[PDB]
Amino acid sequence: AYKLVLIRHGESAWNLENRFSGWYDADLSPAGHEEAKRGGQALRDAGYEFDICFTSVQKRAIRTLWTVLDAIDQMWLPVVRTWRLNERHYGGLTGLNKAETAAKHGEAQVKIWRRSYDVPPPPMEPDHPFYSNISKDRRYADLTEDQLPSCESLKDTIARALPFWNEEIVPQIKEGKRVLIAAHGNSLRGIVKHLEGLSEEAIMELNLPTGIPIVYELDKNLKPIKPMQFLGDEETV
Amino acid sequence: AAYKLVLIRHGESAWNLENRFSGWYDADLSPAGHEEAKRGGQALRDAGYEFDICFTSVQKRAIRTLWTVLDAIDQMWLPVVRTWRLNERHYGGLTGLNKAETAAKHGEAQVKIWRRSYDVPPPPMEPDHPFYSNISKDRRYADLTEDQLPSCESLKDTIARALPFWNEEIVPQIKEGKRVLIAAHGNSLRGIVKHLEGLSEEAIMELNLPTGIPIVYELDKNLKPIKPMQFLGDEETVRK
Ligand SMILES: O=C(O)c1sc2c(Br)cc(Cl)cc2c1Nc1ccccc1
Ligand SMILES: O=C(O)c1sc2c(Br)cc(Cl)cc2c1Nc1ccccc1
Ligand SMILES: O=C(O)c1sc2c(Br)cc(Cl)cc2c1Nc1ccccc1
Ligand SMILES: [Cl-]
């Protein structure tokens, strides 16, 4: 049975995980960093070994992966970064808290956006404070006009994450390489939905815990052989 | 110039503080060596350097130096390639001995020979060596052929196994236009510098790269330096 480990980063600075941090490159807060440290200790105590790591190009996930690699003394592992594992792009909502989002767009539209799998939020427009910060960021300079989102539905996010799973990660898993993925709520949602064949409604109901190793055991067809499991002490699991 | 290349040599390690030979032993930075890396990163940040790809070894004193630099210059998203071929020189059975144990066991004449010699290796690290399984059986070297895994290295050996990685992996990226950062070690960086500047054995053995300080090369399209290496940082640090 292949082993696959996912880890979702924890808290970012300035409450930005509650502010549609999205493609804004928020760093971990001190608390989010401690979360990653605890997740790494849990992987260390459990003696996990990896052969290759995948992460996004967003520093909060990269720093999570660094903290884990440090904790488990495997800083020498190959690391692969990809925009395709980025957090969902929340468009014009990026950086707003819940109250400000409702104030701007009204409760009705907010409910529609919260429940919809395929309706995107408004695009991030040139007058958004993150517009040039994200869209002109050098790490996206190789993306084509059609690949760099101004905004994403959950469908959009999963659609651009899954090609990287199939094209880069699955081959590593099938060679027997032990994969660690440090990424974001919605990109990990895409992977989990593919793994478990979950429904749109289902995946929108799933809220992956942060800072906690998520262990999958896959059969020869990369199908889970049991439910996802979490690593940690008794209280946190 | 056509190209710019930046090297950085990691700073003090935990085993440096013990004056022990580390070589392939995976010693971490001391707090001071970590601080050094932060200052070097800040120098790169103040100069506004941008990179497209980073190379380092599979040793954490170099990897953590790279990480610290990337953090400082807000380029943690860059691709990073790690290779055993940029590891520190392998000191064979000297690995893990401190200065006194080395002088005690081998005597003044022999230690002087090993220090000055380009191609006389120190004793090999034998299966009964206290760090033999820790290093030679470390799964990170699992894909090395038996010929590739050194039991010891002369400086010549270190340079000879570093330069294939330069030629085959770094040169292509440079000529592709990618701005390279190499975070590595004294002797593997010596291999690179010797090839870049066409230095004699004697000259490369006289060269001692400063630590924690960005070393900048301006290279023409044939990767020939168009001037001497430049250290980045305030006037003080550059002077020292
Ligand atoms: O519960 C969640 O995780 C999500 S997702 C999402 C998206 Br897309 C757009 C919007 Cl306005 C909200 C949410 C949301 N909560 C929420 C935020 C503000 C006001 C009311 C509810
Ligand atoms: O006196 C010298 O010139 C040198 S050179 C050198 C090197 Br190289 C490594 C080390 Cl451990 C010592 C020395 C050393 N002193 C010395 C050596 C053996 C016994 C007593 C003193
Ligand atoms: O300065 C250098 O590059 C080298 S290399 C080497 C080797 Br190999 C074996 C030995 Cl006994 C010494 C050295 C050496 N100097 C040195 C090492 C420890 C203490 C004092 C001086
Ligand atoms: Cl990395």
Q: Distance between CA atoms of A57 and A155, rounded to whole angstroms?
A: 20
Q: Tell me which DSSP letter residue B167 carries.
A: I
| Beta-carbon contacts of residue A69 (< 8 Å; ≥ 6 apart) | A40, A53, A75, A77, A79
Place of tokens 């599979």: B58
The ligand with the least distance to the CA atom of B103 is 2
Strands in B3-9's sheet, in edge-to-edge order, are: B80-82, B53-56, B180-184, B3-9, B215-219, B230-231
The dihedrals phi and psi of B43, each to the nearest 5 degrees, come to -60, -45
A46: number of Cβ within 10 Å:
13
Question: Are A91 and A120 spatial neighbours (Cβ–Cβ below 8 Å)?
Answer: yes
Question: Are B201 and B118 spatial neighbours (Cβ–Cβ below 8 Å)?
Answer: yes
Q: Distance between CA atoms of A181 and B65, rounded to whole angstroms?
A: 23
**Token pair of B199 as six digits:** 């230095």
Give chain B's end-to-end CA distance (angstroms, integer).
Answer: 27
HSE-CB for A191 with a 13 A CA cutoff: 34
Q: Distance between CA atoms of B68 and B73, rounded to whole angstroms?
A: 9
Which residues from chain B sit within 8 angstroms of residue A80, using beta carbons?
79
| Beta-carbon contacts of residue A12 (< 8 Å; ≥ 6 apart) | A21, A26, A27, A28, A29, A32, A60
Query: Which amino acid type is present at position A190?
Result: G
Residue of chain B whose alpha carbon sits nearest to that of A66? B67
Q: Distance between CA atoms of B166 and B184, rounded to whole angstroms?
A: 12
> If you take atom 2 of ligand 3, which residue's CA is the nearest one?
B115
What does this entry list as its resolution, in Å?
2.1
Q: Tell me which DSSP letter residue B84 carries.
A: G
Q: Report the gap between the CA of B101 and the closest CA in chain A (Å).
A: 28
Smallest CA-to-CA distance from A48 within A5, A7, A2 is with A5
Which residues from chain B sit within 8 angstroms of residue A58, using beta carbons?
77
Query: What's the angle, vertex CA B234, arms to CA B232 and CA B239, rounded to 5?
Result: 80
C-alpha torsion A230→A86→A19→A229, nearest 10: -10
Strands A214-218 and A229-230: antiparallel
HSE-CB for A202 with a 13 A CA cutoff: 9
Q: Distance between CA atoms of A43 and B145, rounded to whole angstroms?
A: 30
Place of tokens 């980063």: A9
C-alpha torsion A21→A97→A106→A114, nearest 10: 50
Which domain CATH number covers A63? 3.40.50.1240
Question: Are B222 and B47 spatial neighbours (Cβ–Cβ below 8 Å)?
Answer: no
Q: Distance between CA atoms of A60 and A41, rounded to whole angstroms?
A: 18
The dihedrals phi and psi of B73, each to the nearest 5 degrees, come to -95, 10
Q: Distance between CA atoms of B188 and B155, rounded to whole angstroms?
A: 9
Question: Are B19 and B29 spatial neighbours (Cβ–Cβ below 8 Å)?
Answer: no
Experimental method: X-ray
Question: Are B84 and B57 spatial neighbours (Cβ–Cβ below 8 Å)?
Answer: yes
Which residue stretches of B96-229 are H helix?
99-116, 132-136, 155-165, 171-175, 186-197, 201-206
Q: Which residues of A carry a binding-site annotation?
A: 8-15, 21-22, 60, 87-90, 98, 114-115, 185-186
Smallest CA-to-CA distance from B57 within B80, B33, B36 is with B80
Q: Tell me which DSSP letter residue B121 carries.
A: P
Place of tokens 């692969």: A80
Place of tokens 């050194």: B150
Which residues from chain A sit within 8 angstroms of residue B72, using beta carbons?
none
B200: number of Cβ within 10 Å:
11
Question: Are B76 and A59 spatial neighbours (Cβ–Cβ below 8 Å)?
Answer: yes
| Beta-carbon contacts of residue A171 (< 8 Å; ≥ 6 apart) | none
Rg for chain B (alpha carbons), in Å? 18
Q: Report the gap between the CA of A63 and the closest CA in chain B (Å).
A: 8
Domain residues for B227?
1-240
Smallest CA-to-CA distance from B162 within B91, B87, B229 is with B87
Question: Are B8 and B182 spatial neighbours (Cβ–Cβ below 8 Å)?
Answer: yes
* SS3 state of residue B217: strand
Q: Distance between CA atoms of B179 and B183, rounded to whole angstroms?
A: 13
Place of tokens 């690391």: A79
Q: Could you confirm whether B176 is annotated as catalytic?
A: no
**Token pair of A191 as six digits:** 């992977």
The ligand with the least distance to the CA atom of B121 is 3
Domain count, chain A: 1
Place of tokens 């002797």: B187
Give chain A's end-to-end CA distance (angstroms, integer).
Answer: 23
HEC states along chain A? CEEEEEEECCCEHHHHHHCCCCCCCCCECHHHHHHHHHHHHHHHHCCCCCCEEEECCCHHHHHHHHHHHHHCCCCCCCEEECHHHCCCCCHHHCCCCHHHHHHHHCHHHHHHHHHCCCCCCCCCCCCCCCHHHHHCCHHHCCCCCCCCCCCCCHHHHHHHHHHHHHHHHHHHHHCCCCEEEEECHHHHHHHHHHHHCCCHHHHHHCCCCCCCCEEEEECCCCCECCCCEECCCCCCC
Partners of B231 in the β-ladder? B215
Kindly tell me the burial class for residue B141, based on how many C-beta atoms sit within 10 Å of its own C-beta (0-12, 13-18, 19 or more): middle
**Token pair of A90 as six digits:** 């929340």
B108: number of Cβ within 10 Å:
8
Q: Distance between CA atoms of A140 and A131, rounded to whole angstroms?
A: 13
Partners of B183 in the β-ladder? B8, B56
Q: Could you confirm whether B88 is annotated as catalytic?
A: yes
Strands B3-9 and A179-183: unpaired
Determine the distance separating the centroid of ligand 3 and the alpha carbon of B82, expressed in angstroms. Answer: 26
Partners of A4 in the β-ladder? A179, A216
Q: Tell me which DSSP letter residue B29 carries.
A: B
H/E stretch holding B140 reads: none
* SS3 state of residue B104: helix
Q: Distance between CA atoms of B164 and A89, rounded to whole angstroms?
A: 42
Q: Tell me which DSSP letter residue B216 carries.
A: E
Do A59 and B79 count as a contact with CB atoms less than 8 A apart? no
